Amino acid sequence: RNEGQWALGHREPLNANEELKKAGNPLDVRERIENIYAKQGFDSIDKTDLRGRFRWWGLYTQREQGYDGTWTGDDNIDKLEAKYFMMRVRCDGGALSAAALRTLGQISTEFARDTADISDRQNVQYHWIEVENVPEIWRRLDDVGLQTTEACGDCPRVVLGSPLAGESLDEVLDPTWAIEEIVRRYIGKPDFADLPRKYKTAISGLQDVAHEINDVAFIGVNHPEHGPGLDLWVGGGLSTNPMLAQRVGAWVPLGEVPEVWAAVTSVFRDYGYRRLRAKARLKFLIKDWGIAKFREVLETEYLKRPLIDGPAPEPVKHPIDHVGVQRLKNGLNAVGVAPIAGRVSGTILTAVADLMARAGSDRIRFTPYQKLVILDIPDALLDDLIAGLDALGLQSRPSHWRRNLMACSGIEFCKLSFAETRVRAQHLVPELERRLEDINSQLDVPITVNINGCPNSCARIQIADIGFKGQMIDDGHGGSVEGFQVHLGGHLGLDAGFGRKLRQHKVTSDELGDYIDRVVRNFVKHRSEGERFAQWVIRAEEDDLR
Ligand code: SRM
Ligand code: SF4
Ligand SMILES: [Cl-]
C-alpha cells in the first residue's frame, strides 16, 4: 500500500510539491535569477519558480502589508504575496568572521531596509529584499564565504553546532570539522537536493543545540571504550505533531559522522513518505518503523556495517544558552549577548563587527536560541566591548525574561501566521521586567517564554515553561481575532517532554503580560523549595494555571 516512497518503487508524484521537483533540479533556478528575474523583476517570475524553486536558495516571499489572520490560508496567496523577499543566509554553526558579520550588516542597511533578525537556527534573515539585488547579494556573501543554498526547501536546512565549539571548557569534543565536511561534501549537491520535506541537523560537543527536536542529531558523549565521539539521535520535530528524536543507541566517531549523516539522510530520501505534505517529516517514519528497524535498515542498506553501540550523554538539567561571560580553552573570554526575540538591525551587525576589530576578535557565533556570542575577548579589552554592545542594546547581563524569550517572525512578515510575535516581543520584555522586578529575587530559576505566530512552532511552542501558539479566536460572537493558546512546562534535557494544554483557555494579544504575571506569581505562590517551574506544572491544579 502506497505512501509515495522512492525505495518501495513509488517514485510517482502525489503532491504539487513533489510534482515541481520532477521538473528539473529545483536549484537550477539560480541561472534564471541572474539571467532573467533580477533583470526583469517580480512580475516576470514564473509562479512555480517563485513559490517552489526559490526556496532552495533561501528566498521565501514575505506577506503583503495589512492583512490580519482573517486572511491567512493557502487560498489567499495572490493577495498575501508581497513583491519583497525574506532572504535567509545559511550559517552552518553560527560561525562567522568579523568581515562576514560586517557584510551582513551592510547588506541589510543597504538592501533590506536595515532588517536583520537572528533565527533560532543560527541564521540571519533579511526582509524587504528585491530580486534585483539578489545577484549583488550572492556575489557579496561569497566574498566572505557564505551562501543561501538549501536554506529553505525540501533539503538539508542549516546544521546547528555549539556557539562555543572549540573553546568551551565543558565540551566532549569539537565537531566543527564534521559540520564543515558535511557542508563541503553535500550542500548544493544533487543527491540530497530532493527530500520528502525539510531536513534539520544538530551536531555539538554540548547539549546546547536543542538537539531532541532535530531530524538528525549528533551529540558529544564519552565512550567508555572508544573515547570522545558522537551519540546519534534521530526522528525529531515540533510542528503540529511534536515528536522527540530518539536514541539510535549508537556511538559515532568524529571522522565517521559525515558518512553516518549521509546514511541517515539517504534513508530519509528513499523511505520517507511523499504522499501527504503534512506527513512528510522524517519523524513520522521513525514513529512508524520504530527505532530498531531504522537502525537495521540504516546499517544493512546504507552504511553496510553495524554502528558500534554506546551510552547516552548525561541529560543536562538546565538549557545552555551561552549568554554572559565565560572563560575559554583559549585562556580568553567569550561574551553572550541577548537581543529580544533575535531582533537586531543592519546597523547593529556592522556596529558589532567594528567592536570586534577593537577587541582583536575575529570569531562570532549565532545561537540556536536567537542569541549571539563573541569569542576570544582578552580580559584587557572586555569591559570596553560589553559597554560597546550594551550601547547597541545587546545585553550580556540581561534579565530573566530578555534572556529566556523567543519569538518567531509572525504576522509582521510571515504569510502563514495568525498573530504578531516579534514586535510584540520588543515591548512585552520591558513590561515584564518592570512588572515583575517585584518578585525577581524569589525566582532562583529561569522561566522560558516562546511566542509563536501559528501552530508550526518555529519558536518552539511545546518546549517552553510558557509557550504561546498563535490561533484565531472569537470575541463575543461578533468577530474573530488573534490570540494564543498556552502550552506549559515543556523542557528538553533530563526527562524531556511537552507542555500541557489547558481546557477552555485563550490569551489575547493584549493579555500576554497579564497571563505570564499571574501564572508566574501563582508558581511562586504554590511552589516548593528548589522546585523548577516545569515540575510544578505537572502537579498544579487547572485553576492556578489559567
Ligand atoms: C525564522 C524562523 C523562526 C525564528 O525566528 O527563529 C522560522 C520561520 C519560518 N518558518 Fe520555520 N522557522 C524557523 C525555525 C523552525 C523551527 C524550529 C527549529 O528548527 O528548531 C520549526 C520547528 C521544528 C520543526 O521543524 O519541526 C519550524 C517549523 C516550520 C514550519 C512547520 C513545518 C512542518 O514540518 O510541518 C513551517 C512550515 C512548513 O515547513 O511547511 C516553517 C515555515 C517557516 C517560514 C518560512 C514560513 C513560511 O513557510 O512562509 C517562516 C519564515 C517566514 C518569514 O518571513 O520569516 N517552519 N521553523 C526559524 C528559521 C531558522 C532557520 O534558519 O532555518
Ligand atoms: S511559527 Fe508560524 S507564524 Fe511563526 S514564523 Fe513559523 S510559520 Fe510564521
Ligand atoms: Cl524553517
Side-chain angles (χ1 to χ4, degrees):
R1 199 220 54 188
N2 181 307
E3 288 306 315
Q5 308 160 291
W6 285 12
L8 297 199
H10 314 289
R11 206 147 204 157
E12 283 286 74
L14 301 163
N15 302 314
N17 296 99
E18 280 303 302
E19 214 156 304
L20 42 100
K21 295 186 279 176
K22 304 289 159 159
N25 188 313
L27 279 149
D28 274 338
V29 90
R30 211 220 210 251
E31 352 292 298
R32 276 170 272 164
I33 320 256
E34 277 173 305
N35 286 323
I36 314 294
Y37 305 136
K39 268 81 172 293
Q40 261 144 17
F42 200 84
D43 308 72
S44 56
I45 325 165
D46 169 277
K47 277 168 222 171
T48 72
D49 269 355
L50 179 73
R51 296 197 255 242
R53 313 200 172 103
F54 262 48
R55 306 194 153 214
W56 281 250
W57 290 109
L59 299 148
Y60 284 74
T61 160
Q62 65 180 58
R63 170 202 204 77
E64 177 65 85
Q65 288 287 286
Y67 285 73
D68 72 356
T70 316
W71 292 96
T72 293
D74 297 303
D75 37 282
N76 284 297
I77 19 171
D78 273 75
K79 302 282 154 229
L80 289 164
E81 239 167 11
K83 93 172 173 68
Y84 294 93
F85 280 103
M86 176 284 289
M87 199 174 63
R88 188 191 262 165
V89 194
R90 168 173 201 116
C91 303
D92 294 288
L96 291 182
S97 67
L101 191 79
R102 184 172 315 285
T103 307
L104 281 13
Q106 291 151 3
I107 287 182
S108 169
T109 289
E110 192 178 327
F111 280 138
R113 299 194 204 188
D114 225 23
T115 57
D117 303 288
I118 315 141
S119 93
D120 61 19
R121 279 201 83 81
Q122 291 148 241
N123 294 325
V124 308
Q125 297 201 143
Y126 295 136
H127 288 88
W128 299 114
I129 256 153
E130 317 173 69
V131 61
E132 288 73 55
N133 312 336
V134 171
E136 231 278 310
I137 288 179
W138 284 329
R139 213 268 293 130
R140 275 230 217 166
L141 296 160
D142 202 5
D143 272 343
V144 275
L146 294 159
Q147 49 177 355
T148 52
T149 317
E150 300 174 306
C152 287
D154 294 5
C155 45
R157 299 312 179 72
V158 273
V159 179
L160 314 181
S162 168
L164 271 85
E167 308 292 6
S168 157
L169 300 162
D170 321 333
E171 74 187 29
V172 182
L173 73 175
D174 180 358
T176 291
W177 183 90
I179 295 170
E180 282 157 334
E181 279 309 316
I182 288 168
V183 177
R184 182 194 62 116
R185 282 236 267 294
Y186 300 129
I187 292 318
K189 311 288 183 134
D191 357 282
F192 296 123
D194 186 334
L195 292 191
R197 246 187 152 298
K198 46 165 112 177
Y199 188 78
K200 288 174 176 191
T201 301
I203 308 165
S204 178
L206 284 176
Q207 297 169 60
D208 59 355
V209 297
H211 66 84
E212 298 96 310
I213 55 146
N214 275 253
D215 282 308
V216 60
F218 284 90
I219 273 74
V221 68
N222 275 287
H223 187 99
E225 174 174 3
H226 308 292
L230 302 112
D231 191 35
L232 165 80
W233 293 56
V234 165
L238 277 197
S239 191
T240 52
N241 198 334
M243 294 159 50
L244 293 176
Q246 303 171 66
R247 287 198 67 243
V248 168
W251 171 91
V252 180
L254 193 47
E256 289 187 353
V257 164
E259 180 198 287
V260 181
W261 181 90
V264 181
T265 316
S266 286
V267 173
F268 184 45
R269 205 190 43 215
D270 307 347
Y271 288 101
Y273 304 143
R274 303 166 114 106
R275 192 191 58 98
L276 275 186
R277 208 51 208 169
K279 196 187 151 72
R281 296 296 302 268
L282 180 65
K283 58 170 171 185
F284 294 106
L285 186 68
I286 297 301
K287 189 185 198 178
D288 284 349
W289 277 14
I291 255 280
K293 194 186 178 165
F294 176 81
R295 192 182 168 148
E296 184 106 80
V297 171
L298 183 82
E299 288 162 350
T300 66
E301 313 200 6
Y302 298 85
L303 292 152
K304 306 323 280 269
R305 46 174 194 80
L307 277 162
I308 304 109
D309 276 355
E314 206 193 70
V316 273
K317 283 93 129 282
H318 307 263
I320 321 181
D321 65 25
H322 297 305
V323 169
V325 196
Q326 54 177 304
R327 190 58 59 194
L328 302 185
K329 268 156 93 288
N330 270 8
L332 304 166
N333 306 295
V335 187
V337 289
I340 305 154
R343 173 136 276 168
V344 301
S345 71
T347 287
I348 291 163
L349 298 187
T350 310
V352 178
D354 290 336
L355 290 178
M356 280 179 76
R358 268 198 124 233
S361 163
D362 198 42
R363 290 145 77 219
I364 171 170
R365 281 92 194 263
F366 302 135
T367 286
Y369 295 99
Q370 305 168 321
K371 291 108 180 76
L372 63 172
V373 9
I374 320 311
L375 308 207
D376 331 329
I377 318 300
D379 285 2
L381 322 182
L382 171 65
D383 325 40
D384 324 274
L385 172 72
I386 306 269
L389 311 158
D390 249 296
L392 309 193
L394 284 194
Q395 284 154 44
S396 76
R397 275 260 203 70
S399 61
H400 263 223
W401 315 103
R402 184 189 204 85
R403 179 183 168 136
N404 320 315
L405 172 130
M406 310 205 292
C408 64
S409 302
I411 208 161
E412 199 211 343
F413 290 133
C414 181
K415 331 201 292 277
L416 290 183
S417 96
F418 305 105
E420 159 70 70
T421 57
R422 175 124 43 228
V423 190
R424 201 43 259 263
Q426 311 321 296
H427 303 147
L428 179 69
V429 159
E431 164 175 19
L432 291 165
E433 281 170 358
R434 78 173 172 270
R435 214 224 247 232
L436 282 144
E437 156 251 61
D438 158 289
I439 212 86
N440 194 23
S441 70
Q442 274 165 88
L443 287 176
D444 44 51
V445 62
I447 262 83
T448 57
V449 176
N450 293 343
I451 298 172
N452 286 253
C454 70
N456 284 323
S457 206
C458 281
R460 269 101 85 150
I461 305 173
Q462 291 95 337
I463 53 148
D465 285 310
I466 306 150
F468 295 101
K469 183 204 76 142
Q471 83 202 160
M472 283 277 105
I473 65 164
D474 210 35
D475 250 25
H477 225 226
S480 226
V481 207
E482 83 169 49
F484 307 84
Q485 186 205 27
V486 226
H487 290 243
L488 302 161
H491 59 281
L492 292 170
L494 192 60
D495 319 304
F498 308 126
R500 65 189 275 201
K501 294 157 83 154
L502 291 169
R503 170 188 60 205
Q504 224 178 21
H505 183 87
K506 297 153 163 209
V507 194
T508 72
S509 190
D510 356 313
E511 296 158 3
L512 280 176
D514 287 3
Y515 176 77
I516 308 265
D517 179 76
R518 181 159 62 253
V519 70
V520 174
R521 282 178 189 285
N522 269 74
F523 163 59
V524 189
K525 204 117 154 309
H526 293 81
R527 99 203 252 224
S528 154
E529 253 79 62
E531 183 176 43
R532 271 177 70 260
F533 185 81
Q535 302 179 323
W536 175 61
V537 184
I538 116 150
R539 87 192 216 279
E541 314 162 0
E542 201 91 17
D543 293 53
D544 304 323
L545 296 174
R546 313 198 124 242

